[PDB]
Protein backbone atom coordinates (compact mmCIF):
# COMPACT_ATOMS: atom_id res chain seq x y z
CA UNK A 1 0.00 0.00 0.00
CA UNK A 2 3.10 2.20 0.02
CA UNK A 3 2.92 2.89 -3.73
CA UNK A 4 -0.67 4.12 -3.37
CA UNK A 5 0.45 6.41 -0.54
CA UNK A 6 3.08 7.79 -2.93
CA UNK A 7 0.76 8.31 -5.91
CA UNK A 8 -1.78 10.00 -3.61
CA UNK A 9 0.81 12.27 -1.99
CA UNK A 10 2.13 13.50 -5.36
CA UNK A 11 -1.30 13.84 -7.00
CA UNK A 12 -1.18 17.64 -6.65
CA UNK A 13 1.80 19.98 -6.91
CA UNK A 14 0.29 23.44 -7.50
CA UNK A 15 -2.68 25.65 -6.61
CA UNK A 16 -4.66 28.06 -8.79
CA UNK A 17 -6.97 30.79 -7.40
CA UNK A 18 -10.28 31.04 -9.25
CA UNK A 19 -11.92 33.98 -7.43
CA UNK A 20 -11.40 36.48 -4.62
CA UNK A 21 -14.13 38.05 -2.47
CA UNK A 22 -14.35 40.16 0.68
CA UNK A 23 -16.72 39.34 3.54
CA UNK A 24 -16.77 43.04 4.46
CA UNK A 25 -16.57 47.75 6.72
CA UNK A 26 -15.22 50.68 8.77
CA UNK A 27 -11.96 48.69 9.08
CA UNK A 28 -13.74 46.55 11.66
CA UNK A 29 -13.21 42.86 12.25
CA UNK A 30 -14.36 40.73 9.31
CA UNK A 31 -13.21 37.25 10.32
CA UNK A 32 -15.01 34.46 8.45
CA UNK A 33 -16.07 31.76 10.89
CA UNK A 34 -17.82 29.30 8.57
CA UNK A 35 -18.14 28.40 4.88
CA UNK A 36 -20.49 25.65 3.69
CA UNK A 37 -21.86 24.35 0.40
CA UNK A 38 -25.51 23.50 -0.18
CA UNK A 39 -26.50 19.94 -1.06
CA UNK A 40 -26.03 20.34 -4.82
CA UNK A 41 -22.89 22.51 -4.35
CA UNK A 42 -24.73 25.12 -6.44
CA UNK A 43 -24.42 27.76 -3.70
CA UNK A 44 -22.10 28.40 -0.76
CA UNK A 45 -22.76 30.40 2.40
CA UNK A 46 -20.28 32.47 4.42
CA UNK A 47 -20.73 33.52 8.05
CA UNK A 48 -18.55 35.43 10.48
CA UNK A 49 -18.23 38.25 12.99
CA UNK A 50 -20.11 40.96 11.05
CA UNK A 51 -23.39 39.22 12.04
CA UNK A 52 -24.24 38.47 8.40
CA UNK A 53 -24.78 35.27 6.41
CA UNK A 54 -23.89 35.86 2.75
CA UNK A 55 -24.95 33.33 0.10
CA UNK A 56 -23.26 33.13 -3.30
CA UNK A 57 -23.88 31.16 -6.48
CA UNK A 58 -20.71 29.25 -7.33
CA UNK A 59 -20.92 29.55 -11.12
CA UNK A 60 -21.50 33.32 -11.00
CA UNK A 61 -18.52 33.87 -8.68
CA UNK A 62 -15.83 32.16 -10.78
CA UNK A 63 -16.77 34.38 -13.73
CA UNK A 64 -15.84 38.10 -13.99
CA UNK A 65 -13.99 40.17 -11.38
CA UNK A 66 -17.52 42.72 -8.47
CA UNK A 67 -19.26 39.93 -6.54
CA UNK A 68 -22.69 40.52 -5.03
CA UNK A 69 -24.37 37.85 -2.89
CA UNK A 70 -27.42 36.05 -4.21
CA UNK A 71 -28.99 36.60 -0.78
CA UNK A 72 -27.75 38.30 2.39
CA UNK A 73 -29.29 37.69 5.82
CA UNK A 74 -28.59 40.07 8.70
CA UNK A 75 -28.48 38.47 12.15
CA UNK A 76 -28.69 39.70 15.72
CA UNK A 77 -25.27 38.50 16.92
CA UNK A 78 -21.92 37.27 15.64
CA UNK A 79 -22.12 33.88 13.94
CA UNK A 80 -19.81 30.94 14.69
CA UNK A 81 -21.02 28.19 12.33
CA UNK A 82 -23.44 27.28 9.55
CA UNK A 83 -24.54 23.99 8.02
CA UNK A 84 -26.71 23.14 5.02
CA UNK A 85 -29.24 20.32 5.13
CA UNK A 86 -28.40 17.26 3.05
CA UNK A 87 -32.14 16.65 2.44
CA UNK A 88 -33.59 20.12 1.82
CA UNK A 89 -31.69 22.33 -0.62
CA UNK A 90 -32.88 25.57 1.00
CA UNK A 91 -32.52 24.54 4.67
CA UNK A 92 -29.50 26.17 6.33
CA UNK A 93 -28.77 26.36 10.07
CA UNK A 94 -26.75 28.93 11.99
CA UNK A 95 -25.33 29.28 15.50
CA UNK A 96 -24.36 32.58 17.12
CA UNK A 97 -22.75 33.92 20.29
CA UNK A 98 -26.13 34.28 22.02
CA UNK A 99 -26.42 30.49 21.99
CA UNK A 100 -29.24 30.71 19.45
CA UNK A 101 -29.68 28.01 16.80
CA UNK A 102 -31.65 29.52 13.91
CA UNK A 103 -33.04 27.54 10.98
CA UNK A 104 -33.08 29.54 7.74
CA UNK A 105 -34.42 29.28 4.24
CA UNK A 106 -31.05 30.32 2.82
CA UNK A 107 -32.85 32.04 -0.06
CA UNK A 108 -36.00 33.72 1.30
CA UNK A 109 -34.25 34.55 4.58
CA UNK A 110 -37.32 33.41 6.52
CA UNK A 111 -37.02 31.87 9.98
CA UNK A 112 -38.89 28.61 10.54
CA UNK A 113 -37.27 27.74 13.89
CA UNK A 114 -35.45 29.84 16.50
CA UNK A 115 -33.94 27.57 19.15
CA UNK A 116 -33.08 29.46 22.37
CA UNK A 117 -31.97 27.04 25.09
CA UNK A 118 -28.18 27.43 25.15
CA UNK A 119 -27.20 29.68 28.05
CA UNK A 120 -23.81 30.79 26.67
CA UNK A 121 -21.95 31.11 23.37
CA UNK A 122 -22.70 28.45 20.75
CA UNK A 123 -19.72 27.26 18.70
CA UNK A 124 -21.09 24.67 16.29
CA UNK A 125 -24.15 23.17 14.58
CA UNK A 126 -24.54 20.30 12.14
CA UNK A 127 -27.39 18.51 10.37
CA UNK A 128 -27.79 14.76 10.67
CA UNK A 129 -26.68 13.26 7.36
CA UNK A 130 -29.07 10.28 7.67
CA UNK A 131 -32.12 11.87 9.35
CA UNK A 132 -33.87 14.82 7.67
CA UNK A 133 -35.52 16.16 10.84
CA UNK A 134 -32.52 16.10 13.20
CA UNK A 135 -29.68 18.53 13.84
CA UNK A 136 -27.30 19.23 16.71
CA UNK A 137 -25.55 22.14 18.40
CA UNK A 138 -22.85 22.49 21.03
CA UNK A 139 -22.18 25.42 23.33
CA UNK A 140 -19.84 26.84 25.98
CA UNK A 141 -22.41 25.65 28.55
CA UNK A 142 -20.81 22.17 28.37
CA UNK A 143 -23.86 20.90 26.50
CA UNK A 144 -24.65 19.23 23.18
CA UNK A 145 -28.33 19.72 22.34
CA UNK A 146 -30.33 17.77 19.75
CA UNK A 147 -33.02 19.52 17.73
CA UNK A 148 -35.83 18.27 15.51
CA UNK A 149 -36.99 20.55 12.70
CA UNK A 150 -40.60 19.59 13.54
CA UNK A 151 -40.33 20.57 17.23
CA UNK A 152 -39.77 23.80 19.13
CA UNK A 153 -37.68 22.43 22.02
CA UNK A 154 -34.71 20.08 22.18
CA UNK A 155 -35.25 16.32 22.13
CA UNK A 156 -32.10 15.28 24.04
CA UNK A 157 -28.93 16.70 25.54
CA UNK A 158 -25.48 15.30 26.32
CA UNK A 159 -23.73 16.89 29.31
CA UNK A 160 -19.98 17.26 28.78
CA UNK A 161 -17.24 18.06 31.29
CA UNK A 162 -16.12 21.34 29.69
CA UNK A 163 -16.79 23.68 26.76
CA UNK A 164 -17.98 22.12 23.50
CA UNK A 165 -16.24 23.69 20.51
CA UNK A 166 -17.32 21.54 17.54
CA UNK A 167 -19.97 18.91 16.76
CA UNK A 168 -20.47 16.61 13.79
CA UNK A 169 -22.72 13.73 12.75
CA UNK A 170 -21.28 10.57 11.26
CA UNK A 171 -21.72 10.22 7.47
CA UNK A 172 -22.41 6.49 7.95
CA UNK A 173 -25.01 6.39 10.75
CA UNK A 174 -27.96 8.48 11.95
CA UNK A 175 -27.14 7.58 15.57
CA UNK A 176 -23.38 8.28 15.79
CA UNK A 177 -22.08 11.72 16.76
CA UNK A 178 -18.76 13.27 17.76
CA UNK A 179 -17.74 16.53 19.41
CA UNK A 180 -14.50 18.22 20.44
CA UNK A 181 -14.40 19.47 24.01
CA UNK A 182 -12.30 21.94 25.98
CA UNK A 183 -10.95 18.98 27.99
CA UNK A 184 -8.43 18.36 25.14
CA UNK A 185 -10.34 15.23 24.03
CA UNK A 186 -12.73 14.11 21.29
CA UNK A 187 -15.92 12.43 22.49
CA UNK A 188 -17.80 9.86 20.40
CA UNK A 189 -21.41 9.05 21.32
CA UNK A 190 -24.26 6.81 20.21
CA UNK A 191 -27.24 9.10 20.77
CA UNK A 192 -29.37 6.10 21.83
CA UNK A 193 -27.41 6.19 25.11
CA UNK A 194 -25.92 9.47 26.34
CA UNK A 195 -24.73 8.43 29.79
CA UNK A 196 -22.13 6.70 28.57
CA UNK A 197 -19.97 7.76 25.64
CA UNK A 198 -18.73 5.23 23.13
CA UNK A 199 -15.20 6.62 23.02
CA UNK A 200 -13.06 9.43 24.45
CA UNK A 201 -10.01 10.17 22.31
CA UNK A 202 -7.03 11.55 24.27
CA UNK A 203 -3.83 13.04 22.89
CA UNK A 204 -4.25 16.79 22.48
CA UNK A 205 -2.78 19.23 24.99
CA UNK A 206 -5.17 22.11 24.23
CA UNK A 207 -8.89 22.30 23.51
CA UNK A 208 -10.05 20.42 20.41
CA UNK A 209 -11.17 23.29 18.17
CA UNK A 210 -12.27 21.19 15.18
CA UNK A 211 -13.39 17.64 14.46
CA UNK A 212 -14.55 16.29 11.09
CA UNK A 213 -15.38 12.83 9.74
CA UNK A 214 -12.86 11.71 7.14
CA UNK A 215 -15.25 8.76 6.69
CA UNK A 216 -17.34 6.45 8.84
CA UNK A 217 -14.17 4.94 10.32
CA UNK A 218 -11.73 7.85 10.74
CA UNK A 219 -11.97 11.24 12.44
CA UNK A 220 -9.64 14.23 12.08
CA UNK A 221 -9.32 16.79 14.88
CA UNK A 222 -7.63 20.19 15.09
CA UNK A 223 -6.45 21.64 18.39
CA UNK A 224 -4.56 24.74 19.49
CA UNK A 225 -1.27 22.85 19.89
CA UNK A 226 -0.27 23.21 16.22
CA UNK A 227 -1.57 19.67 15.81
CA UNK A 228 -4.03 17.76 13.67
CA UNK A 229 -4.79 14.23 14.86
CA UNK A 230 -6.20 11.27 12.93
CA UNK A 231 -8.21 8.75 14.95
CA UNK A 232 -9.87 5.41 14.31
CA UNK A 233 -13.30 4.82 15.83
CA UNK A 234 -12.01 1.70 17.58
CA UNK A 235 -8.63 2.96 18.77
CA UNK A 236 -8.68 5.37 21.74
CA UNK A 237 -5.38 6.99 20.68
CA UNK A 238 -4.44 8.70 17.44
CA UNK A 239 -3.18 6.91 14.34
CA UNK A 240 -1.11 9.86 13.07
CA UNK A 241 -0.30 13.47 13.96
CA UNK A 242 -0.08 16.20 11.33
CA UNK A 243 2.36 19.04 12.06
CA UNK A 244 3.83 21.84 9.98
CA UNK A 245 1.23 24.57 10.47
CA UNK A 246 0.86 27.13 13.26
CA UNK A 247 -2.42 26.82 15.19
CA UNK A 248 -1.93 27.83 18.83
CA UNK A 249 -4.86 30.18 19.45
CA UNK A 250 -7.62 30.61 16.86
CA UNK A 251 -10.33 28.63 15.12
CA UNK A 252 -8.38 28.30 11.87
CA UNK A 253 -10.73 25.89 10.12
CA UNK A 254 -10.62 22.20 9.26
CA UNK A 255 -12.02 20.43 6.20
CA UNK A 256 -11.76 16.86 4.91
CA UNK A 257 -12.61 15.35 1.52
CA UNK A 258 -12.05 11.64 0.98
CA UNK A 259 -8.31 11.24 1.51
CA UNK A 260 -7.26 14.90 1.87
CA UNK A 261 -7.22 17.27 4.84
CA UNK A 262 -6.94 21.07 4.72
CA UNK A 263 -6.62 23.50 7.61
CA UNK A 264 -5.77 27.15 8.15
CA UNK A 265 -2.66 28.54 9.78
CA UNK A 266 -1.64 31.67 11.67
CA UNK A 267 1.00 32.59 9.08
CA UNK A 268 -1.95 33.64 6.87
CA UNK A 269 -1.79 30.42 4.86
CA UNK A 270 -3.72 27.23 4.12
CA UNK A 271 -2.08 23.82 4.56
CA UNK A 272 -3.00 20.61 2.71
CA UNK A 273 -2.08 17.12 3.94
CA UNK A 274 -2.70 13.56 2.81
CA UNK A 275 -4.29 11.60 5.65
CA UNK A 276 -1.72 8.78 5.46
CA UNK A 277 1.40 10.92 5.75
CA UNK A 278 2.34 13.43 8.45
CA UNK A 279 4.28 15.88 6.29
CA UNK A 280 2.76 18.84 4.47
CA UNK A 281 1.58 18.10 0.94
CA UNK A 282 1.32 21.75 -0.09
CA UNK A 283 0.74 25.30 1.16
CA UNK A 284 -1.07 28.35 -0.22
CA UNK A 285 -0.06 31.78 1.08
CA UNK A 286 -2.71 34.48 1.35
CA UNK A 287 -1.61 37.95 0.37
CA UNK A 288 -1.99 40.77 2.89
CA UNK A 289 -2.60 44.51 2.76
CA UNK A 290 -1.72 38.54 13.32
CA UNK A 291 -3.69 37.49 10.25
CA UNK A 292 -4.91 33.89 10.34
CA UNK A 293 -6.91 31.73 7.98
CA UNK A 294 -10.27 31.22 9.67
CA UNK A 295 -12.50 28.90 7.60
CA UNK A 296 -12.08 26.22 4.93
CA UNK A 297 -14.49 23.88 3.16
CA UNK A 298 -14.32 21.35 0.34
CA UNK A 299 -16.61 21.61 -2.67
CA UNK A 300 -17.49 17.93 -2.20
CA UNK A 301 -19.26 17.49 -5.52
CA UNK A 302 -20.84 14.01 -5.49
CA UNK A 303 -19.46 11.77 -8.24
CA UNK A 304 -16.55 13.90 -9.35
CA UNK A 305 -13.06 15.18 -8.57
CA UNK A 306 -12.97 17.27 -5.39
CA UNK A 307 -10.19 19.43 -6.87
CA UNK A 308 -11.60 22.72 -5.52
CA UNK A 309 -12.19 24.17 -2.06
CA UNK A 310 -12.82 27.58 -0.46
CA UNK A 311 -10.70 29.25 2.22
CA UNK A 312 -11.06 32.52 4.12
CA UNK A 313 -8.67 34.40 6.41
CA UNK A 314 -9.21 36.79 9.31
CA UNK A 315 -8.89 39.83 7.01
CA UNK A 316 -12.19 38.80 5.40
CA UNK A 317 -10.36 37.74 2.24
CA UNK A 318 -12.04 34.69 0.69
CA UNK A 319 -10.52 32.62 -2.11
CA UNK A 320 -11.75 29.69 -4.18
CA UNK A 321 -8.80 27.41 -4.94
CA UNK A 322 -8.34 24.59 -7.46
CA UNK A 323 -5.67 21.95 -6.89
CA UNK A 324 -3.52 21.42 -9.98
Amino acid sequence: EFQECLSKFTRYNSVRPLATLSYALYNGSSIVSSIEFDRDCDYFAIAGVTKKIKVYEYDTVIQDAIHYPENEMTCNSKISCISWSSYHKNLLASSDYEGTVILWDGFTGQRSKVYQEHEKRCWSVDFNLMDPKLLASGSDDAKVKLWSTNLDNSVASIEAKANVCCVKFSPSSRYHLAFGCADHCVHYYDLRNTKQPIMVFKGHRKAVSYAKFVSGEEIVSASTDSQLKLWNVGKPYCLRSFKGHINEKNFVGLASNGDYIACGSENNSLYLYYKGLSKTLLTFKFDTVNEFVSAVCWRALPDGESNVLIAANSQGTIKVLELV
Partner: peptide, 11 residues
Amino acid sequence: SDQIVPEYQED
Protein backbone atom coordinates in the same frame (compact mmCIF):
# COMPACT_ATOMS: atom_id res chain seq x y z
CA SER B 1 -11.15 39.90 19.86
CA ASP B 2 -13.24 36.94 18.68
CA GLN B 3 -12.69 33.40 17.33
CA ILE B 4 -10.64 32.63 20.44
CA VAL B 5 -10.54 28.91 21.25
CA PRO B 6 -11.32 28.34 24.97
CA GLU B 7 -8.93 26.68 27.42
CA TYR B 8 -9.14 24.20 30.29
CA GLN B 9 -6.83 24.30 33.30
CA GLU B 10 -7.19 21.57 34.80
CA ASP B 11 -6.01 22.27 38.38
